Amino acid sequence: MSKISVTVNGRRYPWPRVPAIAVCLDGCEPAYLDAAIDAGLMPALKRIKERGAVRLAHSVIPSFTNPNNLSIATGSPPAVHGICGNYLYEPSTGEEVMMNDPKFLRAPTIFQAFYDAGARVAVVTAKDKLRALLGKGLRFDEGRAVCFSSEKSDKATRAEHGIDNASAWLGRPVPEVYSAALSEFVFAAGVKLLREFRPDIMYLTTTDYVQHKYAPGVPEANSFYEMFDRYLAELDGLGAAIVVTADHGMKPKHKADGSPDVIYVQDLLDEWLGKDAARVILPITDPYVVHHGALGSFATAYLPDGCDRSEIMARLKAIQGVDVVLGREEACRRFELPEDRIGDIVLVSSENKTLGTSEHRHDLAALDEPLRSHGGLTEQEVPFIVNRVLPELPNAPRLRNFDAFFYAVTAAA
Ligand code: VO4
Ligand code: NI
Ligand SMILES: [Zn+2]
Numbered sequence: 001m002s003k004i005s006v007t008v009n010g011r012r013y014p015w016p017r018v019p020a021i022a023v024c025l026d027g028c029e030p031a032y033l034d035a036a037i038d039a040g041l042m043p044a045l046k047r048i049k050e051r052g053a054v055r056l057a058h059s060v061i062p063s064f065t066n067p068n069n070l071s072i073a074t075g076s077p078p079a080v081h082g083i084c085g086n087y088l089y090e091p092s093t094g095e096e097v098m099m100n101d102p103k104f105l106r107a108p109t110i111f112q113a114f115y116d117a118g119a120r121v122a123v124v125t126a127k128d129k130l131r132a133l134l135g136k137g138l139r140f141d142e143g144r145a146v147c148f149s150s151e152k153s154d155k156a157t158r159a160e161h162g163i164d165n166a167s168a169w170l171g172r173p174v175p176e177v178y179s180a181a182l183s184e185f186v187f188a189a190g191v192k193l194l195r196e197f198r199p200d201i202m203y204l205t206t207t208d209y210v211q212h213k214y215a216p217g218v219p220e221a222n223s224f225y226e227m228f229d230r231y232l233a234e235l236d237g238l239g240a241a242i243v244v245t246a247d248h249g250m251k252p253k254h255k256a257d258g259s260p261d262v263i264y265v266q267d268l269l270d271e272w273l274g275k276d277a278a279r280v281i282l283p284i285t286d287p288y289v290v291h292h293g294a295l296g297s298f299a300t301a302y303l304p305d306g307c308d309r310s311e312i313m314a315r316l317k318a319i320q321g322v323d324v325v326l327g328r329e330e331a332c333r334r335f336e337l338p339e340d341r342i343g344d345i346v347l348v349s350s351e352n353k354t355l356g357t358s359e360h361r362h363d364l365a366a367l368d369e370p371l372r373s374h375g376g377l378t379e380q381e382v383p384f385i386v387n388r389v390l391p392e393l394p395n396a397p398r399l400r401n402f403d404a405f406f407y408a409v410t411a412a413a
């Protein structure tokens with residue numbers, strides 16, 4: 001007998017004999033897990049690590065939520081699926097269109113590929129805009145797919161989500177968006193789906209609310225992972241093959257005084273090239289939000305015609321805090337990004353600095369806690385833990401977070 005498989009974006013996925021689950025712990029710097037385990041708060045993960053396969057994997061660069069979640073969902077980098085930020089910039093017209101609608105996804109998900117082959121597939125996200133992206137190509141008329149978010153769980157319908165009101169179904173209220181509970185709801189939904197729906201393939205993804213606010217090992221961070229461990233214990237106990245990984249890590253990005261340490265890339269380009277001659281894009285989050293939430297460690301810039309790119313790149317690279325400056329061609333090759341959705345230059349900042357646009361209008365420092373963020377090479381390294389024996393499993397840099405499903409189904413097969 002030849003074995004059954006599903007081929008997705010040039011990778012062959014064996015059919016899982018038991019449910020195959022990937023859990024994306026948003027912003028989970030490996031240190032978070034080390035600290036919670038050391039505090040005796042994660043007995044299940046502690047045992048799973050001991051008896052399973054423990055690795056570190058490399059995220060996609062930019063180490064942001066959407067590019068990484070979509071890489072995990074498709075088993076491919078942004079050069080294939082097309083989601084390399086939160087919004088793209090039109091060189092002419094000067095228009096900014098969003099990178100949140102599914103029509104911008106250019107490759108099928110593993111979920112669709114398995115669904116189309118007859119599998120039972122489940123996707124639970126914390127935020128609803130990711131739900132729509134991740135759910136592309138799923139159908140809800142055969143009782144074989146479930147896809148909803150914690151955020152809009154009470155709005156779920158059979159015809160569009162595969163379930164009528166996930167809040168009522170789970171027996172928990174819709175959580176606050178800015179809360180640990182938004183992620184807890186995902187884990188609880190995942191367990192109930194495993195019990196009652198028995199998916200062949202399931203993805204659970206969360207938010208990095210807690211991680212942006214609290215460093216590894218502080219009480220509020222520890223309590224989050226303590227909470228997660230309970231659900232991990234239940235999933236593991238139910239017999240699923242599980243990969244626990246993250247979309248990206250998290251580092252402190254604040255000066256000694258606790259204020260954001262920022263390099264304002266637009267200001268610098270204004271002086272050298274003329275005001276608004278170039279356009280700096282910060283892919284971390286939506287461009288019409290200004291409350292310190294738009295600070296990450298990766299930026300791209302669209303330069304005016306007939307300017308010296310090589311000269312502009314050399315000046316930025318000389319700045320302390322700017323670790324990597326590359327042209328579109330080199331950046332797309334190196335980070336595996338699509339050329340048609342990236343600027344003329346790509347900038348990556350140092351470990352404890354971020355990249356902003358300009359100081360005129362600035363970015364409003366609203367929340368108190370010292371800045372923590374991601375996007376750079378220093379948030380690329382993520383945990384990759386499997387609850388099965390897998391001695392051949394590679395390690396970083398060969399192992400990617402978007403190998404999660406490949407190894408989940410392999411472990412399940
Ligand atoms: O939604 V994010 O983990 O790129 O802040
Ligand atoms: Ni909850
Ligand atoms: Zn994230």
Ligand SMILES: [Zn+2]
Pocket residue numbers: 027065208212374
């Ligand atoms: Zn984040």
